[PDB]
Write a protein that binds this ligand. Sequence first.
Ligand SMILES: O=c1ccn([C@@H]2O[C@H](COP(=O)(O)O)[C@@H](O)[C@H]2O)c(=O)[nH]1
Ligand SMILES: O=c1ccn([C@@H]2O[C@H](COP(=O)(O)O)[C@@H](O)[C@H]2O)c(=O)[nH]1
Ligand SMILES: O=c1ccn([C@@H]2O[C@H](COP(=O)(O)O)[C@@H](O)[C@H]2O)c(=O)[nH]1
Ligand SMILES: O=c1ccn([C@@H]2O[C@H](COP(=O)(O)O)[C@@H](O)[C@H]2O)c(=O)[nH]1
Lengths: 173, 172, 172, 173
Amino acid sequence: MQKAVVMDEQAIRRALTRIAHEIIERNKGIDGCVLVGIKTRGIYLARRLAERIEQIEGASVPVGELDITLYRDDDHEPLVKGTNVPFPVTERNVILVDDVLFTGRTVRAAMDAVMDLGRPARIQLAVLVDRGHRELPIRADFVGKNVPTSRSELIVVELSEVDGIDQVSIHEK
Amino acid sequence: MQKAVVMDEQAIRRALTRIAHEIIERNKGIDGCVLVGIKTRGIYLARRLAERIEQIEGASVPVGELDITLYRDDHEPLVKGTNVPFPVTERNVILVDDVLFTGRTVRAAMDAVMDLGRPARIQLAVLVDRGHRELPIRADFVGKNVPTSRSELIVVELSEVDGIDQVSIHEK
Amino acid sequence: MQKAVVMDEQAIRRALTRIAHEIIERNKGIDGCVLVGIKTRGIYLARRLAERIEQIEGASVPVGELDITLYRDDHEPLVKGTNVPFPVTERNVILVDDVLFTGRTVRAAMDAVMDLGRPARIQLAVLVDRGHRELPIRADFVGKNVPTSRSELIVVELSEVDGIDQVSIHEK
Amino acid sequence: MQKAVVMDEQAIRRALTRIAHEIIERNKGIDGCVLVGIKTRGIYLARRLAERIEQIEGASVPVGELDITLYRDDDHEPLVKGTNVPFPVTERNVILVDDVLFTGRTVRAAMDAVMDLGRPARIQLAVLVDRGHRELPIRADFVGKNVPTSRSELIVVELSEVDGIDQVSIHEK
Ligand SMILES: O=c1ccn([C@@H]2O[C@H](COP(=O)(O)O)[C@@H](O)[C@H]2O)c(=O)[nH]1
Ligand SMILES: O=c1ccn([C@@H]2O[C@H](COP(=O)(O)O)[C@@H](O)[C@H]2O)c(=O)[nH]1
Ligand SMILES: O=c1ccn([C@@H]2O[C@H](COP(=O)(O)O)[C@@H](O)[C@H]2O)c(=O)[nH]1
Ligand SMILES: O=c1ccn([C@@H]2O[C@H](COP(=O)(O)O)[C@@H](O)[C@H]2O)c(=O)[nH]1
């Protein structure tokens, strides 16, 4: 069940707008930057960032898509089920986008998929929520909210494009 | 000698816009917030931030001013003048300075605010953190972290007074 | 109600040993360093750190004491007593407390040290940082970062006074 | 040429001892931990950490070895040339050790090599020096010293086992 709401629609809006500004700042413009969303919600978040960056800079940013699913037996392995990145990645700054960073293993799989699409100049990572508990030496460059969790809690990201509401909450039990 | 330009006008512009977003985000809106600039360049930065926040949020943020000078004979920063024409009690007071170095100026500014009234919180925004703290002070909002040696100096130039927006490192 | 144990005796032991190493490393030896404990449990932690540093380095570190109490009617921490039987001028003074929360107690302690003399630097070591700062203060050395809500409370128990070394979160 | 010394023998000693304490603290003991050194100097550093951890805890930590070299054409790719990890990695905390973290691409290669030796519970990263300039979302768990550098500077790590001295310095020109 739902334990607590940790980001409402306004907190998500402000966090996404701030991240768009951070991306442009960090890269000193969006020249050579592309966004790649991870799974359904990462893809909606990537689209939202691209629209915001376009409104700020007046140049559009390509958005690509990775579908990653978990295979089991526990321990699990995230594998790429589908790829739609209809633009070059070689010599670009590829910004991966996901809803939640947890152990880091999904991002490792995504980073590895981009690295074998081509030869990016760099790979960055934007997430709406970092819930801690990394199991790999991976970190986000851009983070909406740091949300401390126990190992038994779940973060649930709801976005209006699929869930009818923008909300992030902690679930348990 | 000027050794490097570390922020140009566009870098400063982007940093101030980003800090404005951070201030609004962290405080969940700007209700109850006020800015207090430290010294000439801190005041100009505080005025810039107030304008950005108004441009983003559609609400104005009061700006106050502290004039702080160094006394010697180890130095001690003292308040030479205060112009804060609004209440500080129950507000979030955001101090603004151009560079954070030892933290001694901010300690003086924080102590000055705490003697004006009873703020809910004091926050600190600086354009540049150059390291070398001598007190347990940190900025809440930072334009750029700029590593320096103790022999180096940060120079912040702002168009209102210097005719250019630029941050540079100097030595010798 | 006690909601969780967040550090047991072995976690506290390991954290204090690690902080002792950090203090020595950051200051490139303990020449010129002194510890000043805040309140009962801060003083016990400062004594533990002094001993660890001596066990590691083979040199003793002076320990001083500040007694700070809350006055009300918003609270204000005030110094009720000081026992710092060594010079602070030109030294690195390392304040020690059990928990960092708003930072208001540390601001009082830092202001007290700065009125004893002219330290080279003031540093801060705490067993627990529970977040929720209301001032631009940060610890230099931290045993554990323990996220809390505003309704929660950290309780630090130390064997000298409580018969157990344990940190816990409480609520209600 | 040598621009500046940034860590002398004493700074390296203290940093390594402090990291050994951090490793034990972070993992709540060294139960289930193994060290894997990267290249010649990472391997000496891994051996030093293992000796320190043994002196502190009174239990030995296995040390494995990866030899990674750069292939070119620039852009480069680090590849594994040799592996000597004579113990299981499955369900262990694998702590990678290297002398310098720069773009992160060597660690990505090492992380990927461990992940295909088996199924570690987690991978951590200890480095003597983080010189910045990441090109991947990778970060060290344990760091000797953060040493700011320009893109034109080099960090040079000298260790007594091969170089006759323990010293870290910045080189240029
Ligand atoms: O509380 C969690 C943990 C993981 N994930 C999902 O799993 C991936 C991150 O998990 P990890 O690979 O970092 O462990 C993300 O794509 C995310 O959608 C969540 O939604 N909520
Ligand atoms: O490299 C520096 C160091 C200090 N200051 C000035 O001194 C104060 C910060 O010094 P500190 O009190 O943090 O040492 C600020 O008000 C700032 O204007 C500089 O401009 N550049
Ligand atoms: O959850 C808490 C909050 C505060 N304190 C005590 O109050 C001071 C820190 O509060 P603050 O002044 O940082 O708010 C410390 O001396 C500490 O002993 C606690 O023990 N547990
Ligand atoms: O200044 C540097 C940069 C890189 N490396 C070497 O290259 C690898 C790290 O580079 P990167 O893969 O993180 O870019 C390490 O194994 C390290 O030995 C250095 O020695 N010094």
